[PDB]
């Protein structure tokens, strides 16, 4: 049930009938992904399927490397004064 009033005297209008949902607090949850440690596989293979797995595993290792840098960094800090 939304209504509105216009005030000619001050060139303004008020829209009423709304209900609030103001954030007052925070809930912090921890999301986890279980990873595995892999370094220098003793394999060449030189077949099509292992080659696909290896380069996909390279994406994995590079992702882990990048995430390790962000662990060392401090988040955000772009605040007004």
């Amino acid at each position: 049930n939304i209504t509105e009033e216009f005030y000619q005297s001050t060139c303004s209008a008020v829209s009423k009938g709304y209900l609030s949902a103001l954030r007052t607090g925070w809930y912090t949850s921890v999301i986890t992904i279980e990873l595995s440690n892999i370094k220098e596989n003793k394999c060449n293979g030189t077949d099509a399927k292992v080659k696909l797995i290896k380069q996909e595993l390279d994406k994995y290792k590079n992702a882990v490397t990048e995430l390790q840098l962000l662990m060392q960094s401090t988040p955000a800090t772009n605040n007004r004064a």
Binding site: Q8, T10, C11, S20, W26, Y27, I38, A76
Partner: protein, 369 residues
């Protein structure tokens, strides 16, 4: 307009606190031990905070079993193409999460479905220490919850990737809210530079809150779902409830209504919830139209208004405005423009951030001189 008056806080201070605890010696083991049996557990951290923990992906089990023994060779050959495809499926979510974090310096908002899927988010909401009415609210507005949430990269240590998801809690619910729309009010005399102007600067969202009123000067920060208004109290000023008196009686003694003055009688329109305010000055062409007929009203100089009933568009100069088509009744409250009450000879015509009484005292001082 009054956005520079807001205070300064850090939105993710809570998540950062939990993240730093995860960097503590031995902290990962508590989470790892509690998730060895299930995927969803409630761990108490070393700083005395109780956090819901969620294991959303187990790449370790897959890699160690369906990949690691085959590559711990010697001569390796892969057992069919579905093993490679399924790995790409499993690995993709990790790559995408890392990707978002790497361009957002470890802090993202809104929280993507990669960080937390629609199914996972609904599961979290169900296990939170909140009212069943709060669960239903967040569940019916998950898209809003997402936009107001943060994801903070924390640790990747001892075969565990952990990041903090910071969800909003709405402690103020179902209190009346109202939106104030304002537009310039100028005199309509024919000489070009002979006009004085006045504009209410207190436009924005207002919500009743804890005996006072929460005022959101940047109304753009609030999110509206039907008749529900989602706002963040960090982006608000706390005002006495007497601020509402400015709407009915702008010269009331209880509250000093904020205004700005100028001599710029420029034309524009403000689309409201159920209509449109039209400030038409000078030689500007101002009209209101319907989809079928075309022009049904031509505005004269001054500040006027039309409801959205039977009106689809409003044109001011070369700008076309579409009105909101929401259902609701509009009331036109007649009254003489307060700009007429002032003497143009002593009217302070350049008050950028002032008020009613402040303008009055300046008039008194100029009059005494």
């Amino acid at each position: 307009f009054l956005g520079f008056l807001l205070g300064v806080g850090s939105a993710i201070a809570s998540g950062v606190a939990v993240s730093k605890v995860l960097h503590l010696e031995g902290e990962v083991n508590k989470i790892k031990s509690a998730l060895l049996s299930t995927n969803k557990a409630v761990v108490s951290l070393s700083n005395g905070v109780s956090v819901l923990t969620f294991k959303v992906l187990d790449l370790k089990n897959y890699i160690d079993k369906q990949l690691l023994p085959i590559l711990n060779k010697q001569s390796c050959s892969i057992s069919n193409i579905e093993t490679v495809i399924e790995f790409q499926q499993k690995n993709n979510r990790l790559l995408e999460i890392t990707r978002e974090f790497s361009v957002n310096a470890g802090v993202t908002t809104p929280v993507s479905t990669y960080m937390l899927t629609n199914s996972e988010l609904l599961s979290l909401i169900n296990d939170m220490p909140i009212t069943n009415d709060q669960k239903k609210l967040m569940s019916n507005n998950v898209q809003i919850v997402r936009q107001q949430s943060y994801s903070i990269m924390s640790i990747i240590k001892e075969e565990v990737l952990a990041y903090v998801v910071q969800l909003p809690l709405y402690g103020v619910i179902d209190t009346p809210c109202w939106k104030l729309h304002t537009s310039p009010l100028c005199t309509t005399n024919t000489k070009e530079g002979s006009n004085i102007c006045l504009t209410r600067t207190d436009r924005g969202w207002y919500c009743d809150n804890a005996g006072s009123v929460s005022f959101f000067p940047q109304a753009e920060t609030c999110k509206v779902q039907s008749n529900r208004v989602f706002c963040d109290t960090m982006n608000s000023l706390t005002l006495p409830s007497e601020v509402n008196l400015c709407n009915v009686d702008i010269f009331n003694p209880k509250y000093d209504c904020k205004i700005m003055t100028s001599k710029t009688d420029v034309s524009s329109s403000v689309i409201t919830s159920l209509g449109a305010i039209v400030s038409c000055y000078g030689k500007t062409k101002c009209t209101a139209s319907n989809k079928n007929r075309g022009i049904i009203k031509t505005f004269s100089n001054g500040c006027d208004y039309v409801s959205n009933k039977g009106v689809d568009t409003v044109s001011v100069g070369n700008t076309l405005y579409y009105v909101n088509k929401q259902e609701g009744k509009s009331l036109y409250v007649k009254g003489e423009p307060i700009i007429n009450f002032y003497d143009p000879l002593v009217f302070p015509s350049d008050e950028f951030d002032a008020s009613i009484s402040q303008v009055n005292e300046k008039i008194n001082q100029s009059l005494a001189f």
